[PDB]
Structure 1
Amino acid sequence: SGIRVHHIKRRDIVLKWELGEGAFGKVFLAECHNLDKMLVAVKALKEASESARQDFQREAELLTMLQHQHIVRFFGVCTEGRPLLMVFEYMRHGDLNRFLRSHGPDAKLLAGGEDVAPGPLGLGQLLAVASQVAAGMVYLAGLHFVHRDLATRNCLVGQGLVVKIGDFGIYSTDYYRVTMLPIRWMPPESILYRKFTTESDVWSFGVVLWEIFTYGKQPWYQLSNTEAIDCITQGRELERPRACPPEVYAIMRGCWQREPQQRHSIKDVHARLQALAQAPPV
């Protein structure tokens, strides 16, 4: 008894090549038949655990029931032989962090694609990406879902700057080696009391908002993991980005209140973000 997970025939999936590697294993570009031929992203678990076979069904069940407009489209699994496979839609731009970086001032005009100009994005484009991520967080907050790793590296960019949350729950400085913590995105109540609620995600979204307007710079990049923990817990906030209007900064400062109850809800942050997106101050 639980969520009916769509199973896919292994012979209906032809692996093209590796797109990347993660904790879970490897991601590939592939063709999928009978879902007409169609390009898709496929995750392959490294397995070698009976437990990891349990986390697979868990994630597959949550993904199958969390389907929405700003969450990466999940098509089903393949348990017909090791390795286990998760099939998703293909977001041709890859993760939001690398996308931002490729449109930043250090990148000059090396960004490609036919859908977006190389070099910096429009203010209205930056607020579109921000608003799309917020909307995905509003949906997850609705189902009492808490994202413990909200960061631009866990979002995907598709054709026409469609941004979705691509990843949910070990060598980058993003994560502190303890359990790996992405402390730099964590509010004080998570570092100090080990609490993570909906309001925690509102604080994390503020950092995502900062990441977006810095073109994917790492929060407190000048500081170590412990130095960042000191700042966060002492009330020191990130500097406004060069490319950030005060109305956006103000939204950021609204997520960075020490008292979680003194933070605006994610539905209000979305709303303020959607508004500006339809009317970018510039």
Structure 2
Amino acid sequence: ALPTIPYHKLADLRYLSRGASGTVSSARHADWRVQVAVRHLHIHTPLLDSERKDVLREAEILHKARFSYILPILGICNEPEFLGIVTEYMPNGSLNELLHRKTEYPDVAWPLRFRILHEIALGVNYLHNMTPPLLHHDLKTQNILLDNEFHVKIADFGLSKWRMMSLSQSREGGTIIYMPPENYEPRASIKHDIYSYAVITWEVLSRKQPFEDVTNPLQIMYSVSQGHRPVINEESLPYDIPHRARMISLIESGWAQNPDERPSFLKCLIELEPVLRTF
């Protein structure tokens, strides 16, 4: 039930960014007369009938996700030399930008930070409650996209066989700060996303870069496999943070070394719901 958008309907392709999962461009849809984003791959090697139908079936599965805080797939661009995922364009970039561009936003109020946290949690919760469940497996501040009025849309969920394609078209690497230590030695584990969520939650409340001072990413990887985490004290997480106790609980249970110890997103929601009634 996933539409095919022909290449020619996407005008004014401006490059925005590239990573493991391909290139991100803005475009104008010629018929809808709105802006769209497109994640795409220029495919160098020809691509087997088996391998193409795989990526399409994935995209078709991911198309089924329709929820307020999920960035929905609008259609697939399926060209001989070009594969593309067309999504709504998000004017305000990512959560990454809202937190760390401290010049452009000197002040990110508590009610907003907490609404973001709630919406991420509702998003991943929805994803996990699909049949079959849809796991994100690369949740990070860059995927948490912000619409015109700073509401959350989670992007790039379930891009598994897609990411193996942009692997193939090489013959660099994405951030590991939100990756649970089990995953370092490659899996199908429901408790991956909650680890990421926990690190995100730390980042949202601290407004600090996780492992900021640690220069080598392998250093980070060793540290966390030995159970080290972003530091929780008065400097990183000030005493004035609303519901500080409850949030630290959520964070620590979230990034627990043992997967079994980590909450479901339903558990986050139950815990968060009281916090939000404050605002």
Normalised-by-shorter TM-score class: 0.7 to 0.9
Task: Tell me the residue number matched to 1:163.
Answer: 152
Which of 183, 193, 207 pairs up with 1:190? 183
* Identical-pair percentage: 25
Consecutive unaligned residues in structure 1, runs of 5 or more: 112-117, 170-178
1:173 matched to which residue of 2? none
Does residue 256 of structure 1 match 2:255?
yes
Q: Of residues 15, 37, 40 in structure 2, which corresponds to 1:41?
A: 37
Correspondence list, 1:109-188, <5 A: 111=104, 118-143=105-130, 144-168=133-157, 169=159, 182-188=175-181
Measure, in 1, the Cα distance between the counterparts of 2:40 and 2:194: 31
Whole-Å separation in 1 of the counterparts to 2:110 and 2:252: 19
Counterpart of 2:7 (choices 10, 23, 30) is 10
Question: Is the Cα–Cα contact under 8 Å of residues 117 and 201 in structure 2 kept in the other structure?
Answer: yes
The 1:16/1:186 distance shift into structure 2, 3 A limit, reads: closer
For the structure 1 residues 90 and 225, does the alpha-carbon distance in structure 2 shift closer, same or farther, using more than 3 Å as the test?
same
**CA pair 278-82 structure 1, distance change in 2 beyond 3 A:** farther
> SS of the residue aligned with 2:183?
helix
Shift, 1:195, TM fit? 4.6
Task: Please report the RMSD computed on the Cα atoms of aligned residues, expressed in angstroms.
Answer: 2.7
Equivalent positions of 1:1-282 (< 5 A) are 4-34=1-31, 36-49=32-45, 50=47, 53-54=52-53, 56-80=55-79, 82-102=81-101, 104=102, 107=103, 111=104, 118-143=105-130, 144-168=133-157, 169=159, 182-191=175-184, 194-215=186-207, 217=209, 219-223=210-214, 224-240=216-232, 241-242=236-237, 244=241, 245-280=244-279
Residues 184 and 19 of structure 1: CA distance in aligned 2, closer, same or farther (over 3 Å): closer
CA drift of 1:233 comes to: 2.5
User: What is the count of residue pairs matched by the alignment?
Assistant: 254
Cα distance in 1 for partners of 2:82, 2:155 equals 21
Q: 1:174: which partner in 2? A: none
Assess if the C-alpha contact under 8 Å between 2:17 and 2:23 holds in 1: yes
**Aligned-residue offset at 1:267:** 0.8
Residue matched to 1:114? none
Residue 185 of structure 1 contacts residue 207 of structure 1 at CA under 8 Å; is this kept in 2?
Answer: yes
CA contact (8 A) 2:44 2:81 kept: no
Q: Give, in whole Å, the separation in 2 of the partners of 1:257 and 1:150.
A: 17
Could you tell me how far apart the structure 1 residues matched to 2:94 and 2:208 are? 11
Q: Any idea what SS the aligned residue of 2:126 has?
A: helix
- Return the alpha-carbon distance in structure 2 between the equivalents of residues 43 and 235 of structure 1: 35
Q: State the 1:257 CA deviation.
A: 2.4
* C-alpha separation in 1, matches of 2:229 and 2:58: 34
Who is 2:162 aligned against?
none
Residues 198 and 255, structure 2, Cα contact 8 Å, conserved in 1: yes
TM-score (norm 1): 0.79
**CA shift digits 1:33-81 (9 cap, x unpaired):** 43x5212112231212416745541442132112322111221122255
Runs of 4+ in 1 over 4 A off after TM superposition: 179-182
Which amino acid counterpart does residue 132 of structure 1 have in structure 2? E
Q: Note the C-alpha offset of 1:155.
A: 1.8
Asked whether the 8 Å contact 1:190–1:196 carries over to 2, the reply is no
CA distance in 2: counterparts of 1:16 and 1:216, whole angstroms: 34
1: CA distance, partners of 2:120 / 2:83: 29
